[PDB]
């Protein structure tokens, strides 16, 4: 069944047949089950996946999400999947501009599946949904964490390391406005929600690790969030210019105060470790950032 | 006719007391006779009562005055009834907070207010906590806003609220004085519980009457927009400082004032007014300074 | 100092640790109790590389539920040390000596509704680990080990085997009501509690009157719901013996008597499974024809339509060959 969708694959734009594509991406995840995972053969077939979703440019939606769900099916019964989301991370951020608009990006195309027509909602919520089940994942593991305590930490901290760029990639993305702003903001609450879980751990049971796992969610992570509540105010302003209107702005700005309350909880958390370890963890955060408003009475006429 | 004959009974002992717990007794006592919720006359005569007992000023035989952890329960509970009972509370409260503290900061050295003696240095906390649990209470009261079914009745709940917030913004810029740790638990305690009740009861209000009436609605927003960012300050002091016992406080607080803002840009997206609204980034200053 | 000693200084058994826990009824109960269930866990786990250690455990735990019953009070502190283990270890302390001692308790009513509910509640935890392990390489990599509760619940059915009383009661009343408990890990629970009466039944020959009048009578209690995994219990047990309905005879009529209340196919399973109680028995044929007659000039469609369709059975089920 392979030859079929490379020879349709490779078919010039007249004749393209994109039910007999979708049809024979299914039949192909249909199939993939019988393989056993040790096998040689899953290994070819990862390759083939990989292979074919680098090489080959499609403009299709439907298409384009059946083959990243089949490549992460593969994906996930194999190895951890940190390191592809983190390549198609750094891929939508190149194909997009970026909110500083002071900044220059050029090339780096590492997937030719992933371009400007398809770094639509498809692909946002596609990798946000891999990032979820990694932290639902995750979650599972730290309550099972509180010789075996140290590889299991070692293992612990390598994936919010690894999950903390691909959120730092995808927070400097003007992205449209739609529900992978939605999403994103989702995601980002939950990731602080966990670290704060980590840390209650180590807060019942100082290591370099932890320390060096702060500083980078102080340096990577926390100073960008508030850059991006900024750029929705914006994004939003100017979506809603085109447009029970009070509810749609209700449902629009709901996850903004869940982000705050995170960070204010995880910093919180912190204070507490450090002064209960006498080290000063809390040197590697800046200071917070507040909005106040206005009214200019001269624009309500 | 029983009841009332042994109240007056009772009451005519008032001339007559040695020290501050006989007269907490007579008070307990006074209570515990009369019914559950008190008739108009008792009430007035107990409020009558519990301001007398108040403004007094009790020394003990050897001189000195009385301070200690049975002196500050009992004042506590006296001026809990106090307020209870008074025919106005927000008048009390706006008489007190403007008349005792000013008098005891400009000239009493060391002593206390003139107007109230029972007030001291030390038992300002109690006097604190007890004008700001009572002004929640009171504000927690008012009816919500009906569906623009209010003629006129909407000028007198805008007028209740006004004297709400210009009470909580008097009793607010007195946190700059005393930098007492109990004071700032206080303050970040109630702050939060008086911002979600004006957020969940007159925000309604808001929304109907904004076309009728807009120059209160503005000035009422000024004026609650200096308390907040008081508040915002203070959450930042505690923050720097990391007093393990005031940072609790401080997630719940800064959640409810991010939600006021987006309520406010609901509120004026309900009458087609978007384009008016703006944000911005506000500069972080320490307590009375800058930077 | 004293029970930790004798802890560690070890036929003469029985009688020795009934004076411990006499002086432990005195004394501390949970470290005598942890000490002996995990004394008796090395010791299964040496057989694992055996009739007298058997016939010794049922001895003990014989005068250990004796003694709980004639103390109650230890009752609440030995469930309290089991939910501090089941806290501490990820399914840990659950052996089959401790099971075994556990669904021994459950007979006499003190708190056995805590026992199930404790039990159950533990074995959907089991699985649902066990579930979410599988899905993951990542976490198979570093999680290697992984403590499947089914396989000893599974192994005190043999165990159980060699003639213990009280073990093969509470494990039967565990296995009944593990299907009102269920009503996907509530699947895996009723298959669960289907295995352990098909085991239990081939196991305990004596036992076999007391299986099938009660999942005869559970049967045709009340149709309020789906029951047709008791019938396919009901189809496995019977087909395994099949005299053993004919000496349990005379309530099939009775459950026949009413048959045509809640028909959602079923009656055709039941049918099928009973057949061989109606072709051997001439007096059961002709109640259910009388049954049948009753059905057929029934004025209703609803009974009319379960009639008709056992009817079939009824007509294709014996050969008029002759």
């Known amino acids: ?51 074919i979703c680098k090489e080959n440019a499609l403009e299709d939606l439907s298409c384009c999400k059946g083959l990243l769900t089949l490549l992460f099916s593969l994906h996930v019964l194999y190895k951890s999947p940190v390191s592809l989301l983190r390549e198609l991370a750094q891929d939508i951020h190149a194909c997009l501009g970026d909110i500083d608009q002071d900044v220059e990006i050029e090339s780096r195309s590492h997937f030719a599946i992933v371009n400007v027509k398809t770094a639509a909602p498809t692909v946002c919520l596609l990798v946000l949904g891999q990032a979820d089940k990694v932290l639902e994942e995750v979650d599972w593991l730290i309550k099972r964490l509180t010789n075996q305590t140290q590889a299991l930490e070692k293992g612990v901290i390598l994936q919010l390391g690894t999950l903390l760029t691909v959120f730092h990639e995808l927070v400097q993305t003007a992205l449209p406005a739609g529900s992978c702003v939605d999403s994103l903001l989702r995601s980002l609450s939950k990731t602080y929600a966990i670290l704060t879980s980590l840390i209650k751990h180590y807060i019942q049971a100082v290591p370099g690790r932890l320390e060096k796992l702060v500083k980078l969610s102080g340096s990577h992570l926390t100073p960008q969030c508030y850059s991006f509540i900024t750029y929705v105010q914006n994004i939003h302003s100017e979506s809603l210019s085109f447009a029970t209107v009070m509810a749609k702005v209700l449902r629009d700005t709901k996850p903004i105060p869940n982000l705050i309350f995170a960070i204010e909880q995880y910093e919180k958390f912190l204070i507490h470790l450090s002064k209960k370890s006498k080290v000063n963890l809390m040197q590697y955060m800046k200071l917070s950032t507040s909005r106040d408003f206005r009214i200019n009475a001269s624009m309500l006429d | 006719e029983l009841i009332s004959e042994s109240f007056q009974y009772l009451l005519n002992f008032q001339a007559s007391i040695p020290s501050f717990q006989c007269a907490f007794i007579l008070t307990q006592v006074l209570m515990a006779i009369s019914e559950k919720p008190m008739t108009g006359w008792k009430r007035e005569k107990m409020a009558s009562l519990a301001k007398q007992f108040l403004c007094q000023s009790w020394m003990k035989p050897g001189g000195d005055r009385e301070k200690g952890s049975h002196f500050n329960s009992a004042l506590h509970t006296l001026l809990c009834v106090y307020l209870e009972h008074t025919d106005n509370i927000l008048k009390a409260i706006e008489e007190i907070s403007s008349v005792g503290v000013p008098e ?26 007890v004008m700001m649990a009572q002004l ?13 079914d209010s003629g006129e009745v909407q000028l007198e709940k805008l007028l209740k609220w006004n004297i709400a917030v210009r009470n909580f913004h008097i009793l607010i810029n007195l946190v700059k004085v005393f930098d007492s740790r109990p004071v700032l638990s206080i303050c970040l305690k109630y702050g939060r519980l008086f911002v979600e009740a004006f957020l969940k009861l007159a925000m309604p209000l808001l929304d109907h009457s904004f076309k009728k009436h807009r120059d209160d609605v503005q000035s009422l927003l000024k004026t609650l927009q200096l308390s907040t960012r008081q508040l915002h300050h203070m959450c930042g002091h505690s923050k720097i400082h990391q007093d393990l016992g005031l940072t609790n406080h401080v997630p719940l607080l800064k959640k409810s004032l991010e939600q006021f803002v987006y309520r406010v840009k609901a509120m004026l997206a309900f009458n087609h007014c978007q384009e008016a609204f703006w944000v911005g980034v506000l500069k972080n200053r320490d307590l009375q300074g800058e930077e | 100092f004293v029970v930790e000693k004798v802890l560690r200084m070890f036929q003469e058994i029985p009688p020795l640790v009934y004076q411990l826990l006499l002086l432990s009824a005195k004394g501390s109960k949970k470290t005598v109790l942890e000490g002996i269930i995990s004394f008796f866990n090395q010791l299964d786990k040496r057989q694992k590389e055996l009739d007298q250690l058997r016939h010794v455990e049922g001895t003990v735990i014989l005068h250990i539920v004796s003694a709980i019953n004639l103390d109650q009070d230890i009752g609440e502190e030995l469930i309290k040390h089991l939910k501090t283990e089941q806290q501490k270890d990820p399914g840990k302390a659950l052996c089959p000596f401790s099971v075994s001692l556990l669904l021994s308790t459950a007979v006499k009513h003190r708190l056995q509704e805590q026992i199930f509910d404790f ?26 080990q992984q403590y499947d509760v089914t396989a000893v619940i599974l192994e005190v059915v043999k165990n159980s085997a060699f003639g213990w009383d009280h073990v093969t009661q509470g494990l039967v009343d565990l296995g009944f009501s593990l299907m009102e408990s269920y009503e996907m890990p509530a699947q895996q629970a009723c298959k669960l509690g289907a295995s352990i009466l098909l085991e239990t039944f081939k196991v305990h020959e004596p036992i076999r009157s007391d299986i099938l009048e009660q999942v005869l009578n559970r049967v045709l209690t009340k149709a309020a719901s789906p029951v047709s995994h008791f019938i396919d219990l009901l189809s496995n047990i ?5 005299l053993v309905l004919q000496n349990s005879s005379s309530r099939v009529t009775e459950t026949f008597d009413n048959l045509s209340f809640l028909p959602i196919d079923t009656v055709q399973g039941l049918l099928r499974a009973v057949q061989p109680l109606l072709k051997v028995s001439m007096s059961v044929r002709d109640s259910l024809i009388l049954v049948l007659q009753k059905a ?15 009817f079939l059975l009824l007509l294709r089920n014996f050969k008029i060959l002759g």
Do not use: H, M
């Open chain 3, 119 to 144: 039990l159950k509640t533990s074995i959907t935890r089991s699985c649902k680990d066990l579930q979410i392990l599988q899905a993951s390489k990542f976490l198979q990599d570093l999680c290697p």
């Open chain 2, 104 to 129: 005891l900061i400009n000239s009493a050295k060391d002593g206390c207010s003139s107007t109230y003696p029972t007030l001291s240095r030390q038992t300002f906390p109690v006097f604190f906590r």
């Open chain 3, 296 to 310: 057929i000039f029934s004025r209703q469609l609803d009974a009319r339509k379960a009639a008709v369709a056992g």
């Open chain 3, 238 to 242: 019977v087909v395994s013996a099949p």
């Open chain 2, 136 to 148: 929640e209470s009171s504000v927690k009261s008012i009816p919500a806003g009906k569906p623009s």
């Open chain 1, 1 to 51: 069944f392979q030859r079929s969708l490379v020879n349709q694959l490779s078919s010039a734009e007249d004749d393209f047949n994109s039910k007999e594509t979708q049809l024979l991406i299914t039949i192909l995840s249909t199939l993939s089950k019988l393989l056993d995972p040790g096998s040689q053969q899953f290994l070819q077939f990862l390759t083939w996946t990989v292979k």
